[PDB]
Every structure is written in C-alpha cells, then in structure tokens.
Amino acid sequence: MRYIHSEETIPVPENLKVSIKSRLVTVEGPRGKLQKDLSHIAVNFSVVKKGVIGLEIHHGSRKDVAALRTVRTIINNMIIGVTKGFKYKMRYVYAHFPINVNVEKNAETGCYEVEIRNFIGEKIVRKVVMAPGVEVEISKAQKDELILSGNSLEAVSQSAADIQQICKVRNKDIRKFLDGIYVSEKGNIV
Amino acid sequence: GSLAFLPRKRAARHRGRVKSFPKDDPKKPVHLTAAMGYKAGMTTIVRDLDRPGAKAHKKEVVEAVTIIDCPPMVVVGLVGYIETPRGLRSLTTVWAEHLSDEVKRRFYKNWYKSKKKAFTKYAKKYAENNGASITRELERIKKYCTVVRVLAHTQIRKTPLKQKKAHLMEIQINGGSVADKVEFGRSLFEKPVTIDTIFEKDEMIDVIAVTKGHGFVGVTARWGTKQWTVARAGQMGYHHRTSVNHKIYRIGKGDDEAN
Amino acid sequence: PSEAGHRLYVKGRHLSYQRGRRNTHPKTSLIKIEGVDDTAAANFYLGKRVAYVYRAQKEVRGTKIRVIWGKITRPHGNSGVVRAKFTHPLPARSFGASVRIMLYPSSI
Amino acid sequence: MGRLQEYQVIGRHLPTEANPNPALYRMRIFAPNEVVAKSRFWYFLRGLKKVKKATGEIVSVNVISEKHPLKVKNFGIWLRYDSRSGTHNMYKEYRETSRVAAVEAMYADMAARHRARFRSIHILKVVELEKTEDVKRPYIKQLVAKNLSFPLPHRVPKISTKKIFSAKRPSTFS
Amino acid sequence: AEINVEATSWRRVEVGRVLKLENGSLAAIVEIIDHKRVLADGPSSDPKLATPRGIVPLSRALLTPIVIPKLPRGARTGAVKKAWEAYGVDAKWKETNWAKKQLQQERRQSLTDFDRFKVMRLKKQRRFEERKALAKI
Amino acid sequence: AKSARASRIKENHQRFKKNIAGPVEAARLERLSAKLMAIAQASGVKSGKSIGRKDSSIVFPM
Amino acid sequence: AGTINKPKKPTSKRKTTRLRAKISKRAAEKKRKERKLARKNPKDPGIPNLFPYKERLLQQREEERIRRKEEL
Amino acid sequence: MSSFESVVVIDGKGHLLGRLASIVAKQLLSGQKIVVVRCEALNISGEFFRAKLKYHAYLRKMTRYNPTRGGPFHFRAPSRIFYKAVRGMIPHKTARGAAALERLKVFEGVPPPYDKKKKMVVPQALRVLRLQPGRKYCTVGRLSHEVGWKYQDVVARLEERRKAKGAAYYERKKLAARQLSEAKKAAAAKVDPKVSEALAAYGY
RNA sequence: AACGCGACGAUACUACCCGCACGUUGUAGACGUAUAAGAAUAGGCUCCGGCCUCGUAUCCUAGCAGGCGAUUCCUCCGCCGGCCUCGAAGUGGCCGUCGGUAAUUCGCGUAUUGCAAUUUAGACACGCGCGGGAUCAAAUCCUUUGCAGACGACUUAGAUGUG
C-alpha cells in the first residue's frame, strides 16, 4: 500500500555510547563492545532526543515496515548485554553413568571448550568449542550445573544449544532414557 | 572396467610424472619430497609381526618385498614457480656449473655425433661479472615465487644398465619460507643426495611408474568380460599408474656388505 | 612546431545494410555518426558527403588508396543513425569499418 | 482509454404522430472522441429503454470541461465490473485534479489490480468529496495528513540512453 | 547517553519548497498530489525562471535548497508571488551552485569560433604562471 | 556400512591425524631434515641484488 | 528435495504444432457444447455502504418516487 | 555522449550479467574493442540457489557417445560464464560473428596492463540503478567457486596487493591536487586582470 | 587442448643482434585512437574551508602537413646513461647530458593544387638494403636394443669408452 512514513524508538541508558556508521551499529558500555552489520535492511537511523535513537523508513510496504520491529529488538538486545549481560544455566542429568564435564580455556584462539565424557557409558569424548565471548563455569552452587554467560545473546544461546545437540541419545527410547544436558534458566547476569 | 582410467592409451612419457606434491606449510622443517630409483626385482622375507588385534600377532609371517636400486641423486638445478589466475607458472630456472655428461645426454637424441655444446655459455655467466646473472635469478625466486623445486638426476653407471642417459626430474622442497628453501637449493648444487636422507624406514610412500605393456588385445583380457563404456579392443598396458601406501621395509646402504 | 590536428570530417561507422529480418538491400547503408542521438541532430548531416577510404594492393594512379563516394539521405530510427546511398554499395566486410563524413555541401 | 473527455450527450426517440415532442434523455459519457460518445450513448440507452440509433437522433453533444483544473480534489468512483463469476461492486478513491483524470486513473487501476476491460466497467458515480472526513480509504488518508512532507530515497538519475559508457559511478541521493 | 549517528540528510518535498525542472525554470510546491506528483507555481518575473501553475511529476524535478518559510497550502498565484518576492527566491537561486554551473554551460555553448580561439590563448597565458608557481612548489 | 566419504568417518580420521599419527610424522621429519642439512652444509646492479629484466595477447596492438 | 543440487529433466515449455492445433480444436467444441446445452435449456447489490453519500442518494430515490407517484 | 574509442575497459563489479552482455555484444558488432575486468564481481539477479540450479541444469547436458568431442564444454571460470552470455548474443558461426568475438577480452581481476588504465562503467546495467532495493542478488564469483573454479583465493590475494599499491597512488594524487590548488591561488595574483576577467565572461 | 600457455639449453646456413634506409609488403579498418584510487548507493569526498544530479568534465589544443635569429626562460616534450623499481600475460620513477620548444614580442617566405576530388602521413608485423657486431648446431634415415611393438610409434646404444 506504500505507507509514506513509519518510525520506532530505542531508548538509550546514560552509561552507553551508541555509534552508527552506514548501517554498522557499535554499542559500548561497562561490560564491553558489540558490533553488528545491518546493511541488509533499508533503514534511516536518526537522533530524536538526548537519549533516543530514531529509526525510520519511507515509502515502504507492510513487509518493510515490519522489518523495523526486528531491528529495534536486535539493537535493544545489544544494549542489554552491554549493560547487564546474559546468562544461560544448564543442567545435566543421568540415571546410571555420571556425566563428566570439563571446561578449559584455549590460550590460542581465545575461546572456551567444553568436553563431555561418559554419556550413557560411551567412551567417545565430545568436544564443543564455544563462541568468542562466552565464558563457561562449573556451578559451585548446585549439583550438575553450568553457566554460559556473555554479552551477545546470539553467542550465548547458540553455544548453549550446541551442547544440547551434542548430547542426544540415538536409536533408543525417549520415554525411558532421560540422559542429557538441558537449558534450565535464561536471564541476565546483573 | 573402471571409468576412472578410461583413456586407455599408452603413457605419454616413459618416466611418468608425480602430478601432485604434498601440500606445503612454512612451519615444517625444510625437506625434499620425492626421489628416483630403478626396479631390480622381488624377494621373500620373514617379519616378526607386532599387530595387536591380528591373528598373526607375535608370530612369523612370510611376505613378498620389492627391491628398488637407488644410486644417489645429484642436484643440478632449482626451479621457481608463481601463482596465477591461470594456474601455476614457471618463472626462473637456475642451473649450476660442471653439469655431468649423463644429464647432458638427456638433452640430445644423438650424443655420439654431437659437438656436446650444451650449457657451455651457461658455464660462463658464473664468472662473467662475479655471477651477477646467477644471483639476480635467485633473488627473483626469493621475492616473487611461492614454491621452488629442485632438479636432480640419477647416475646410470652405478646401475647395471646398458643405458647411459640419465633421468632428470623436478623435486619440490616443502616446509619453510621461500628464502630458506632457495638457500637450500643453491647449497645443494653439485652434491649427491642419498635415499637415506630423503626417506626413512617404516614409512608409507607413493610409487609412480608406467606399467607392463601388452600391445593390442581384445575384450577378453582388456576388460575382463565373459562409446567409452562399451568394451572395445585396443592397447593394454604401458599406462601411467600411481600406487599408494607401500611400506619401506629396509633401506640398504650398499657399503655395509651385510645388507 | 604546431602539435595540433587536421580533422575536418566527422567520424562514422558502417553498421549494416537496409534490411528487415531476412531480406537485405545493399543499395542503402546505415551509418552511425559520432555524437548524434536524435533525428534533430541527424537533420544537420543530411546531404553531407560521405567517403569510405580503404586499402588495395596495386598502385593505379600514384596511390594505393581507394575511395567510394556517397551522401546522407535520411535519418534512420530515433537514435540518430542515418541512411547513406553511395555510387556503389559498400562492401559487406566493412560492417564496423570507419567512414569520413565531411561538412560540404555547407548550409551554415 | 487515452485522453478522455467528459461529454454531455442528449438524445431522443424520433418524433412520430402518436408521440410528438419525445422524452429527451441525457447522459454524461467519458469517451476518447465525439464518435465514441454517441456509440456509448446508444449502447447504454438500448439496455435501459427501447431506443436505438435507427429510431433515435442526437440532439446535442457538448464537452464538460472542469471548473477548476488547477485545484487538487479527492474523488470517489462507484463502479460495477464483470468477471468470470459475475457482476461486483466497488468504491475507490482517487486524489486527482480533474474528473477525467480520475477516470483515466480508474481504468488503469482496474486493468492493473483486477484485469478489467473497458467493455466490462460501468461507471455509476464520480463524486468530488468536498470535506476531508468523507475520504474513507487509507491510501488517500495519508495524503491528506496535516503537515505532510516526505523525502525521496534512492533516486536513480536520468542518464541518457545513448551514454553507454560512464566514467564515474552514479549516486542515488540527489 | 551518547548517540553518534551519521546516516543521511535528504531534502524533503513540502509546501513552499522550490523545485528545478528540466527546462531550467523554478517552481514552488503549493500542494502535494501523491508520492510522485505535486502542484507547483513559479511566479518569477524572470522569463528564464517562470513556470505556469500546474502538475509537475517529481521524476522531472530536482529539489533545491530553497524553501519559502510559511507558504500556505493551496495558495494561489497572488499569494505565492508575494512570498516569492519577500523571500527573494531569485536572488537566493543566483547564489546557488546549481545556477552558477548552469550559467557556465550557457556561456560555453554560446562561444563563437573566434571566442574559442581567444579562450584557448588566454588559457595559455594563465597556464604559464600556474606552471611557474607549481615549479616553485 | 559407512562410506569412505562419511562425515563421521572423516571426523574420526582427523582425530587420528592430530593426536596419534601427527607427532610420529613430525619426529621423523626432524631427523630427515637434520641429515639433509648435514649434506648441504658440508654496487647493487653489479652484485645483482636489485632485480632487473633478464636479457603479447593481453593488450590489443597499440 | 535436492532439486538445486540434482535437477531432473526439464519440462519443456516449447509448444508443438500438433498439440497447439488440437487445443484450438478442443476449445472449439467446448464452446459448441456450451452453446448447445444453453440452447437445450430446461439482482442489483445496491449502493456500497462505504460510499459516503448513500444517504443523500437514497433521499433522491424517495423524492423522485414521490414525484412519480404525484404525476401518476 | 556517443564516442568511438580505441579500447573501452569496463569494470565488471556491480553489473548485471545479461544486461552487460547485450550492450557489449552490440558494440563488438559495431566495431568497438572491449576489455572486461573483474568478472568474479558481476551480479546475477535473484537468489543464489536459482543461479546454482541453472548451472547444475547446465551441467546435466552432456553428450552420450563421446564427451571429449561436441559436448557442451562447461566452463567454470567467471570470465567464461560472462563469455558464454556474450557468445549467445553474437552470430558466432559466421565470419562477422567470429570477428566480433576477437574484439573482446575478458579477465578475472584486473591484469597489470589494465590496472593503470581507466575502467569505464555502464549505467544501463548497474545493479544499484536497475534493481529494486529489496530484491536478492548473487555474485558470479560465488557461483564459480561452488562449481569448480580453483583460483578464487589467488585472485583475492592479487586484488589485495593491487589495492595496496593503489592506496599509494592515491596518496601521491591527493598531494598533486593540493599542490595544484596552491599554484592556482598564487598565479591569480600575478595574472593580468584583463586575462582573468575575459576568461570568467567566457565561462572558463 | 595434436590451432592453450610458461621456463631453459644449443642454435651451422641463411643472416642471430645493433644503427638507420626504403618498401607496387600484409591488416575485420589510425587520424588528439590522451584520462589508474578504493568503496558506499537509506550515502560519500575533502586541502577540514567546504563540496557532490550532470565526463555538456580535465589535459592537450596557434606557426610552409608547420624555418632561421633576437629578447625572455628554466615552461613543455624527446633520446641515451647511473641508481632503483615493475612478475596476474612483467615497467615506471628520480637524477644527469644532449636536442627541440610562441610562456610575451618580432623581421622574411607561402600565390599557379587554377571553384571540390582520401588530407597517400599512424601502428604492429613482414621483406629488401648497407655498415658494424656476433656464431661455428642439430634432427631424421642407417646399424643396434627389447623396459616396447600389427606397421608406425616408444626405452636405448653407435665419435676411443666403466664403449
């Protein structure tokens, strides 16, 4: 129908500096730096108030206006991770074979790796390399819990999902074999 | 038969080419990657097997082994190559002085009546200014080439053959910067390289040669039966084959007298 | 010295004959003139003399260079291509060859 | 259907002895020319009454020019069109300058969205909407917004088609 | 809170915005028809810049940096002419880089064969002192 | 059975190459390079350090 | 479906003269069969509600109906 | 405007493949020599898997009796993907069509004669001017690499070196533009005012 | 790839190379065949002043088809040397010598081609010329071999040698 104007708003907290190039978005704050490229969507970024980012499209369709809603949440997610961060808590359960989980930090390539051993008695080791920017720690607070924390929700949630998919039973009965590692809590560090 | 070896024609050259050297990384030490030898024949050995999981574990096995006679190759050259959108291009070949008559026989089809003038002017540029043409051509390899090869030839007098014409082949240097392998190649000039230094015992190697020729045969023996896919008569044999994963069981010295 | 030029003609290219899909008529040639893009520009060049200068192998009257003469007849299409009739039809191997389009006879 | 003009066509049945001074019907017809306007008159009168060209005559044909061809107006067109299923009703709005221009905009619009032909479209009413609240469709509503102003992103420059080769790459900003 | 955005800066079509057409004349938007048509009027006393009031496609128009400040929507030719002279649109157009380059094209097209000869030789006298200054630098 | 080009067969072979067969081949290449090193060790234009020119279908003939 | 990696044989959109001539024939006797069955034999929706002036059009209908009743 | 040049070097980056091929084929048959560079950077409109499906359909068509003779030779290189489009728009089985093809040279990357020449552009086939802002496009270099082109990494390294040298050339170019503007300012104070007033009145 | 390409060795004749001298020498077609950033297109460039639809731009552009002297100058162009640089199918920069040079100005020539007739002019390649440098080779046949073989073709050996 070619709507003439459509706009949305991203509020910015006082401890942040948001810098936008052509469509490259950089958010700085207490916890670190996040960048992501938005050249695949036609959008006009602007400044409306002291702490408000204005994003507009002109002469777009219903599809192009709706693509403004995904970029508003994506930038707002970068605001949250830079301020408060993200935390995924994962529990691993077993019936007879205890699951040994080992987390080391690689000096080269600068990323954590999680090694899963003894999954329903299997002798294969399962190595999962994490995304750059997510730290994994063994919970010395409850039994059989890992914490995946970081600034990027994309990096934390994908690395958590990689662990689930690497410990998955095959050629068995789902109703009886309940062994696996599962995401228990999702939220913020602060 | 296999459609992978489909152009069942005679091999284009008697020697047969490598067609693929190992992929090179600069972190490795400098080493050569190939060699040449002459097929002598086969013998029978007994090996005390150590194969955990085998029925012949810690037992005696009788195996057939092949003997290849390897006089020490003499390094005479150095060839640099550059990367291109069209492929790989040879940029500079640098030979040495005092080239032997054996490899000089290779550049002639009638050695017995020629004036033997090959590389006579090339021997003069090593003492023309101070060797400026030689050093310039090596610096061209160092600053422009991405991988360098070594020209080495075998000697037929050490072998019991009626041939006198040496076999000249390019051997790739792997594992280092282009500057490092060039200083290998110039230092290795005029020097015999033994098979003790190229290969080692207990190592799978790759063997490349041209098979036994059988001439014109029909479909009974050429294909193995009771367009390209239709079994038709033609040449069997004298084909280029690359064989894979053959163990080096021993490397004899020749001096030892108890091989 | 001077370091200038001596061109008193407008460069052209011989494109094709007058044709439809399949029938070609060599009596009229189609010429592309340097820098013309409408029929209004092509109206200036109507009646101007066209020379096709080529090379031969035998000297005849002190020269080895031969010329076929013609003149611009009418504009062709909307793109400033023009129709030219010569005393003899131009060779078919000269499709894409250059012609010289001269400013005489002049009405300016 | 081209540069249409509005015509005032008045026609009547031929005067007879039984009925002198006949009925005198009048229509407004959007036609490309004089000759088409007579033909659409007798086609429409044949469906309504039993008056044809053989027993009827044209009294007057006049062109109805716009009162104000320099003032922007919101128009409403009520129309019927015939499809494979049957006859349907639509009401569409057009922000134009003249009543003929709204009819040209309608014919191209019905050909574009619904593949309707001139022979299938019946224009019943073309009404100038005097007040802003009478506009009902959202595509006209955003045009009559208060303090309406918009930019023009991604404007491809007008480069001559005979300029095959350009030296520098063009820009789509101004 | 620091926000550093450098995205775009477009000129907007609006009531009172001065357009430049392909003919070289000036028009001023009075009311907006659609997203690609506007109603404009050029009341200028210069014949080179005068445009009759009518519909102009925006594909045939170029947006100038000149906006008449408080021009009413739907204003007729009397009101537009008063605001044209009060704002001095002709004087502000003359200072624009678009009119300066257009005037350069008019002078270059009007050169006679003699004028081209004197242009060329006077350039050579100017180029000489540019070349001595460049050699000093 | 599994193909020779199976993904899990390839991943098992990569674990064999890195952890078992890797250091064996690196050790044998250090000895062989040591023996090759033993055998091999046993003005600007005038010196030729600057590289000049020795001693056409890409460009149309100009 | 792995049609991107391994496409099948294409369905040709080139029209044969043999099939073009039959389709024009089969379209012809369908029109004849439709005309024969119609020969064999055995509503105004009104002004739209979104029309802004249905009210003043309806009163024109009532006023003309009064004038027709007065004339008759 | 409309000009006859010796050789027109076209930069293939940002161009639609078929729209550039029809313009080039017309100039070749008119008697114009054309060199196209950067054919790994051309674009084909539509999604990438549609261009991949078309090439996999092209790979199916192979002759049965003898693939070495007469079969469709499937060229994987980005220069030859472009050359196939141009050859289908030229009567290449006639002598005139063969002569037009010899006026064309197609390259991957920018060869060292042509990195110092000026690369022209065709606005009539440029992607930014032709395509809708929301539509999807693919690059010929990406399609070539997935069907067997072996020198994507070689061309990329050479283009990085070519742009490293061109950054040095631009730095000398900016200095020349700075020095030319300073020399013009100094010469304006020593020129006779009748020379400059006449040049201003003439538009120069 | 027997009509795709690279590196190197030796190249007797002829003439392999250098200089300049001309061709009834051949062309899918010279006539200023002048012009390098990269990158984005819902953004860029910059001398940081500002600028951007627009290559209708910039350079070059005058003189018997285009002299000799003067003043004025280190303005523009070209050849050879030294230093370096340029490998994707390989070149440009700096310095120096020499030569030419309306940037301002000047003295003396052009007629008759008769009122137009391609303005025979460029480039690469191919030849013939001199007068100078340089060079002193291979292959096939024949005999032989059998790692090969229907015939061709292929691996070899025939010059004093570990033949």
Structural class of the secondary elements of chain A? Answer: alpha+beta
Q: CA-to-CA gap between the ends of chain A?
A: 44 Å
- What is the tally of helical segments of chain A? 2
Which pair has the most extensive contact?
B-F, 30 and 21 residues
Counted beta strands of chain E: 6
Across the major sheet of chain A, the strand order is 11-12-7-13
Rounded to an integer, what's the Rg of chain E over CA atoms? Answer: 21 Å
Total beta-strand segments of chain A: 13
The proportion of residues forming helix of chain E, as a percent range, comes to 25-40%
Question: What is the strand content of chain A?
Answer: 35-45%
Q: How big a fraction of the residues of chain E is strand?
A: 25-35%
Q: Helicity range of the residues of chain A?
A: 10-25%
Q: Please write the string of helix (H) and strand (E) elements of chain E.
A: EEEEEEHHHH
Sum up the overall morphology of chain E in one term.
Answer: extended
> How can the largest sheet of chain E be summarized?
5 strands, antiparallel
Topology pattern of chain A, helix = H, strand = E: EEEEEEHEEEEEEHE
Strand order of the largest sheet of chain E: 5-4-3-2-6
Termini separation of chain E comes to 48 Å
Shape of chain A: elongated
Q: Please tally the helical runs of chain E, counting DSSP H or I stretches of 4 or more residues.
A: 4
Compute the CA-based radius of gyration of chain A.
21 Å
PDB class: ribosome
Keywords: Ribosome, Ribosome biogenesis, pre-60S ribosome
Entry title: Cryo-EM structure of a Chaetomium thermophilum pre-60S ribosomal subunit - State Spb4
Chain A: 60S ribosomal protein l9-like protein
Characteristic key phrases:
part of a larger assembly; 8 chains; C: 108 residues; mainly beta; six-stranded antiparallel beta barrel; 1 helix; 6 strands; globular; F: 62 residues; mainly alpha; RNA-binding
